Amino acid sequence: GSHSMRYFFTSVSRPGRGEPRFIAVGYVDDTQFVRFDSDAASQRMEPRAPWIEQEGPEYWDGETRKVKAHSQTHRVDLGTLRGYYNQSEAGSHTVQRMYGCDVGSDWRFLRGYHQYAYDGKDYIALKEDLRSWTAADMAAQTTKHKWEAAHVAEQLRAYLEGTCVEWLRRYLENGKETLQRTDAPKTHMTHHAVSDHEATLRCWALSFYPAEITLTWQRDGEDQTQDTELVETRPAGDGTFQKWVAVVVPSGQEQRYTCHVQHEGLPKPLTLRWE
């Protein structure tokens, strides 16, 4: 299976007074492992997973230097983009950035990403070949030109195919006990009468990791989407995830309906029957 390392950055201008609010978070797959918040006292990159605490002071000194530098880049960008879009100094605006790399089952580089948004819309993104850029509008063409002239893509690709992968490999090894452990969903079904004649069947998947999962109902062995309901996958708060799907059925006919669960942690999909 592949694994990913992603950093997410959000910068929000506060025109009234002072510099933007800057928040950076780092993830391996679905596990957050580092954070920086401009409003926090430490003014340091901080650990958020036990396995990153293995890294010594030089690591934190290094990441802190870079993340502070990232925050300045975003503060400058907010100024620049306000100018491109002819906006007032009065409003608050947002830049968002996400970059990172995947390795495959062979633990070699698989994919790299670098994308940038302004006010919640695409602005500029590195293409899958890591050699060129996609600009969403004419303002972004300016940035594209500048980055082409400065050969940003070449420097980015070197990081993504090199440093990025190498550290991802390190984190995976250091955090193997959790990062490389799949937690299959604990599944069960609840039953609620909604009348004398109808009941709700709810199929629950709990305590699973990673987040990706598929939960579906079948009736007499064919998929059923009508009269169903299904919540978005949500964090339990202990590092795992939760999901449920529900169906309304005539009382007494429950045996026709089966819940099917697919997850990386299951060698074979699960089929639950209301007994």
């Binding site: 880049t73 983009l81 970059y99 500029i124 990081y159 990025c164």
Partner: peptide, 9 residues
Amino acid sequence: VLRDDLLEA
């Protein structure tokens, strides 16, 4: 690990 430097837009 973070990238060492980001160019301005």
